[PDB]
Amino acid sequence: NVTDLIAILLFSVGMILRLQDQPFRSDGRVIYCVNIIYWYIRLLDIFGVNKYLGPYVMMIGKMMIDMMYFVIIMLVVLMSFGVARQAILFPNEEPS
Amino acid sequence: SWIERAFYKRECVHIIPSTKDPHRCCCGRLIGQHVWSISKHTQLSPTDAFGTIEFQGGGHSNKAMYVRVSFDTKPDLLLHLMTKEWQLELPKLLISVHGGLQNFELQPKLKQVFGKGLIKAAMTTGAWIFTGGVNTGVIRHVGDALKDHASKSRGKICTIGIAPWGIVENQEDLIGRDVVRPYQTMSNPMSKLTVLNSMHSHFILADNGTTGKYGAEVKLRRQLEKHISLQKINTRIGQGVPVVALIVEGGPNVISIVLEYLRDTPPVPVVVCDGSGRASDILAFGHKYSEEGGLINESLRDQLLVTIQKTFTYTRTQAQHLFIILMECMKKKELITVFRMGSEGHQDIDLAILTALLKGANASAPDQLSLALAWNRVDIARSQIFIYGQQWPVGSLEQAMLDALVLDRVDFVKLLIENGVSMHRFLTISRLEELYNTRHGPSNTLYHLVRDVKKREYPKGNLPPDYRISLIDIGLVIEYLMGGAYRCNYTRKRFRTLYHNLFEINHFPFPFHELMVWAVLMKRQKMALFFWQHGEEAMAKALVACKLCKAMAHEASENDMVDDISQELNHNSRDFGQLAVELLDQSYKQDEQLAMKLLTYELKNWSNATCLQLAVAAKHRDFIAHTCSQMLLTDMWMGRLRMRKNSGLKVILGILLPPSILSLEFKNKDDMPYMTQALIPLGRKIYEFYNAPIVKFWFYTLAYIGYLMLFNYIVLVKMERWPSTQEWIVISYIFTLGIEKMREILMSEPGKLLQKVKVWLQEYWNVTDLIAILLFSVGMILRLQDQPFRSDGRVIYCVNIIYWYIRLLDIFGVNKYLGPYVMMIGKMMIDMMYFVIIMLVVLMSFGVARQAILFPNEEPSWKLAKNIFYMPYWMIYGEVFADQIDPPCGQNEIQLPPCKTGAWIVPAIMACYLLVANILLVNLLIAVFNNTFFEVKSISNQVWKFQRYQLIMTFHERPVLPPPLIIFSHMTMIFQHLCCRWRDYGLKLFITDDELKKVHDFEEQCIEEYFREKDDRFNSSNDERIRVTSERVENMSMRLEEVNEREHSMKASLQTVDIRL
Amino acid sequence: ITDDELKKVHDFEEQCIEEYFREKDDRFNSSNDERIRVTSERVENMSMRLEEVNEREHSMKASLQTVDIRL
């Protein structure tokens, strides 16, 4: 319900931006697409009523914590390789 | 409101005679407390004190109904009150407990034994206990016994106490009309009035008008006991309910009560107890020292006189009068049963009570047997009624057998069968019809089944209430519940001819079969398990009972009945299935070949079926997955071939190179002839080889794998205007296979076409087959036209090639490892579908967001919906489309197109989508597949082992020739059908009579082994041994303590003897 | 619900409470551990009081021997 109200405030911001002229209309459109992402996940919660889909959804929510720890370890290894590759292959770079 | 309008009461309206105390009237109440006709002048009125009593305090809370009644009321009305308003059934036994009104204490062992006896006697026979009501003396001991009863037994012992209304404390507390009135169990010691006993069940509190005086209830209680004893018991053999009179202690009046009981028509037995004292002890001292009843000599006469004058403290003439009343009692010495603590006094209250009832009835042994049947006491019947030398009337034992059967008494049927009654000489058609029309015992759903089959047979409706269910209707019920082509013996023409001509020819050859079916139909599980043990064809009976219980459970669930009935019927079905499995285990352990002969022989008493067919028709997965049934199915699979070494290759060599058949080792002519309906050696070998199920399956498989290549050739190479030779072969294969599938629709098990189609559509691989033959017909019709329809027919041909490769997967289903693998895949499709649903939500969210950001100015077109699903779906399988993740734009490298607004969001939500999909959901489906692998694997193995039978029966019923040449065999069947018109699906054995007797004797040996082994395993378990040791140690400690008391007494006697000498 | 239905519900609840408690007492009394403990305590009490029975049997045998010697 609080994610619902956050995505209604976001829709209000997107509508207020869209009802003006350019370049704010495209910004309102960009907000509309993030809203469509949220409403598909709200459809996942609506699937939560079914006797098999519901436990599946909270099972996914339980494995998010293990996913986060995997993300942390992958983040350390990923920036180590990325910084090493970018720092070797591009020696003369300006701050950007 | 009936209770007030039917019962009356009396209140003290007198002249207030003072006598001794001026406040105390003739009724004893206070002189200002007012508001028989002799000196009390009482008036009659409707009652105002009746309802329910909530006993507050005294430990356990117990609710007791109560009425205040007049002492002169007719006992029939009160009997109607107990039977109707209090909802109490007529008891099988009446107990009248009498004793001293003064409080007394007994020995602890005597009190414990008397309490346990009175509780068990009221519990097993379902008796009524009649006490004095108030919580004094013997009724207080009965109340302590009932307190112990509510501490270790789930009985609601009906213990109606009758007390004077004027003597119970707090008379104003019990005033109401159907009103729950609380009561106090506390008793003031200063008040002469006593409270009621706390844990009685009902109260017949009787008012004569007076208060604080007794005598208002004795005549009413005696008349009510007489009126109950005049009522006939439910056995209807010609006897009323038995009445016993238990006496503990007592005073002067209980001797007169014993005289009234003994000198009565009919006489009432009296059971007394020893060790309490007073009148019971003088009765015991008279009874031991009696000689020939009233023949009592002078010395014990004077001893009885001095003990009466001492213990009761009376004069000489009062003791002489009491001794005269004692001798008048003792003239009827046979009725009085004396219980003695310890010694040889039956060591129990209840053996004394029930033996006293049996010889107080003094009737024939049928009457005693019907009394024991009503009391549900098999043990007393065995130890008294069936003693040695007992004379039995002719035909009475079979009547008792019928009465025991209709009342659902397992142990009485066991006792009667062990005592000479035989089922073959007893069970007739009329007796079985009476058993099928009984109304006693537990409830059943047979009447619903009879109503349904009567509605289906004659579309009437509800049956009349006075409907006698014939055996033909029972046969229709069995035919409906069994299903398929089952035909009960009742509905055959021989039985209908015997029924019309009669309503040892009427006796059943296998009476335990009919008793098993009747016990299963009316849901009497213990009697069904007893009837399973006795008789032949045990495994067939178990499988038939399993299918019948499952079908009755399904019908009870379908008719919206009580769900507990359906659960109990499913439990009965599972118990019978477990019995059949254990019998198969025992038969496999003893002899393998005789177990095969047991499994395959035709059951003439069960519609010519087979034990394997009965197990398959009951979906018994554990029966067919057993090793004996599996290797039996393997023997059915090879046909008339020994072989059994390097399978597959030898029959493929036989099919491809037919001279290899002659070198194959064939089976004997009568080794195991599984048949359906009951140069020359070279032709016999060829016919025996080509009709084997494994040979037919490999011929059909090698034709399938030569059809699939031809289909591949015609779809890969181009086609001209007319089809080539290989396409004509493929078209011929499809048409002959379609004709074969219609022939499987026609030659099915049911009789009406819609049922044939409905049975055929359970095999999903056949309806998918027919769908892909209709699709081929559509594709051929489109292809035989000109362009552009020819390419459409080609496009349909490729979807057909996809289906036929999956049909090859089902053909791999025959192999012992590939088959369970295929159904394992089919089980994981559901988890795959749920993963598809979650992936679909995440996939369209990313696709819609990406397409809506990167393409702002778009017209309505169906390419948007394609672009939603196109690239995010291939993003899962290692193709991220790296050139389109974030192309450079808004710069000059040639002028690039300008940057779309918010186009930087697309790689970020791409990152979140790829992470969630590829890492979360795929690994979660890995975990789902992994943690449900073991159960699915075991279930798939067992289901494949079950479906081996369906595969074997299908490929044995198939034509010999493969589908591209099956039109010759189809014309052969058409010509044979036309010849038979112009002029039994299974594989049985059809053994002879001596082989049948050998098989039956093997089955009885297996049944005895299985049951007894189970008894030996139960008796040798740790739990049963520990329980037996604990019970023996308890009995040993308490009787051993009695040995110690006797050892102390013997040491005292030896010390006195040594002191004397 | 009404008052008669309330009384029926309350009586059903008391029946369920008695069933649950007593069933628990029956399950406790029929367990292997409680049976083994009761058997061991009864056997101990029986051995020690039985040893007292033996001492009294020796005394009674001595008294019977003395009485036989006297007569």
Ligand SMILES: CC(C)CCC[C@@H](C)[C@H]1CC[C@H]2[C@@H]3CC=C4C[C@@H](OC(=O)CCC(=O)O)CC[C@]4(C)[C@H]3CC[C@]12C
């Ligand atoms: C288009 C792109 C950006 C993909 C979107 C990815 C995420 C924004 C989504 C994908 C799956 C979603 C998850 C799917 C399942 C659940 C469980 C559900 O939570 C519960 O049911 C509460 C109980 C529990 O957490 O166990 C809702 C949140 C959560 C973590 C969701 C949070 C948002 C997630 C990570």
Ligand SMILES: CC(C)CCC[C@@H](C)[C@H]1CC[C@H]2[C@@H]3CC=C4C[C@@H](OC(=O)CCC(=O)O)CC[C@]4(C)[C@H]3CC[C@]12C
């Ligand atoms: C360890 C794992 C589980 C998480 C770490 C990965 C993300 C934090 C990275 C991977 C891809 C990255 C994105 C790749 C490309 C872009 C586009 C970039 O925008 C531009 O460069 C502007 C347009 C242009 O110049 O072409 C802004 C950052 C962003 C969204 C990046 C944000 C950070 C992301 C999502």
Ligand SMILES: CC(C)CCC[C@@H](C)[C@H]1CC[C@H]2[C@@H]3CC=C4C[C@@H](OC(=O)CCC(=O)O)CC[C@]4(C)[C@H]3CC[C@]12C
């Ligand atoms: C940029 C590229 C070159 C990637 C770098 C790869 C390796 C140099 C890193 C990646 C993960 C590292 C490992 C992550 C975790 C551990 C456990 C940790 O060891 C302990 O905590 C000691 C106890 C134990 O070994 O169980 C430190 C070493 C080790 C093996 C690390 C050794 C170095 C590894 C293999």
Ligand SMILES: CC(C)CCC[C@@H](C)[C@H]1CC[C@H]2[C@@H]3CC=C4C[C@@H](OC(=O)CCC(=O)O)CC[C@]4(C)[C@H]3CC[C@]12C
């Ligand atoms: C332990 C781990 C998580 C540390 C990872 C740190 C880096 C990812 C961060 C920290 C410092 C950052 C730098 C801090 C300062 C700058 C200067 C900045 O220059 C400008 O914005 C241009 C200045 C101007 O012209 O106004 C460009 C990004 C950069 C290189 C940042 C790039 C990203 C860096 C290396």
Ligand SMILES: CC(C)CCC[C@@H](C)[C@H]1CC[C@H]2[C@@H]3CC=C4C[C@@H](OC(=O)CCC(=O)O)CC[C@]4(C)[C@H]3CC[C@]12C
């Ligand atoms: C029993 C099972 C395991 C195998 C039985 C199937 C094969 C013996 C069949 C199925 C596909 C057939 C092929 C399908 C198509 C052709 C093309 C055909 O060539 C032509 O029609 C044009 C040239 C010519 O006329 O010879 C020659 C036969 C051949 C190779 C066939 C040879 C026999 C094959 C391999």
Ligand SMILES: CC(C)CCC[C@@H](C)[C@H]1CC[C@H]2[C@@H]3CC=C4C[C@@H](OC(=O)CCC(=O)O)CC[C@]4(C)[C@H]3CC[C@]12C
């Ligand atoms: C029963 C089916 C399902 C499997 C049995 C396989 C064989 C009996 C079939 C399969 C492919 C057939 C072949 C497919 C094509 C040809 C080409 C055909 O060539 C011609 O007729 C040449 C002259 C012309 O083009 O008319 C001769 C028969 C032959 C060898 C066929 C012979 C019979 C074969 C080997």
Ligand SMILES: CC(C)CCC[C@@H](C)[C@H]1CC[C@H]2[C@@H]3CC=C4C[C@@H](OC(=O)CCC(=O)O)CC[C@]4(C)[C@H]3CC[C@]12C
């Ligand atoms: C060329 C492309 C289109 C690939 C084709 C994909 C599907 C059309 C196929 C691939 C695997 C097939 C499955 C493989 C295994 C089985 C088990 C089998 O079912 C049984 O044996 C019944 C018992 C059970 O379902 O457990 C046949 C259906 C099914 C689900 C199949 C259904 C059709 C599937 C999904």
Ligand SMILES: CC(C)CCC[C@@H](C)[C@H]1CC[C@H]2[C@@H]3CC=C4C[C@@H](OC(=O)CCC(=O)O)CC[C@]4(C)[C@H]3CC[C@]12C
């Ligand atoms: C969540 C997962 C498990 C299932 C969702 C994926 C499918 C439903 C999608 C992914 C790829 C899609 C296909 C991608 C491309 C096409 C071609 C398209 O045909 C054309 O565009 C015509 C030819 C042309 O214009 O080039 C028709 C839809 C179809 C089959 C799409 C149908 C829907 C598909 C199978």
Ligand SMILES: CC(C)CCC[C@@H](C)[C@H]1CC[C@H]2[C@@H]3CC=C4C[C@@H](OC(=O)CCC(=O)O)CC[C@]4(C)[C@H]3CC[C@]12C
């Ligand atoms: C909860 C989830 C499953 C919802 C997903 C819905 C979308 C995938 C569907 C629903 C509405 C559909 C739209 C409904 C109407 C049109 C107009 C249609 O326009 C035409 O056919 C052209 C009209 C003409 O010229 O005749 C093109 C497809 C499109 C955009 C559809 C594209 C697919 C949409 C967005």
Ligand SMILES: CC(C)CCC[C@@H](C)[C@H]1CC[C@H]2[C@@H]3CC=C4C[C@@H](OC(=O)CCC(=O)O)CC[C@]4(C)[C@H]3CC[C@]12C
């Ligand atoms: C619910 C799960 C278990 C199954 C997945 C079902 C849907 C996700 C599939 C099935 C039917 C599919 C549709 C079948 C046909 C089309 C037409 C297709 O149209 C074109 O490609 C037009 C040609 C072009 O302009 O490129 C676009 C995809 C779409 C809507 C498909 C979108 C995805 C759908 C809805």
Ligand SMILES: CCC1(c2ccccc2)C(=O)NCNC1=O
């Ligand atoms: C079409 C496949 C097949 C077949 C072949 C081998 C094994 C199982 C099934 C057949 O060729 N004719 C009978 N029924 C069939 O579906």
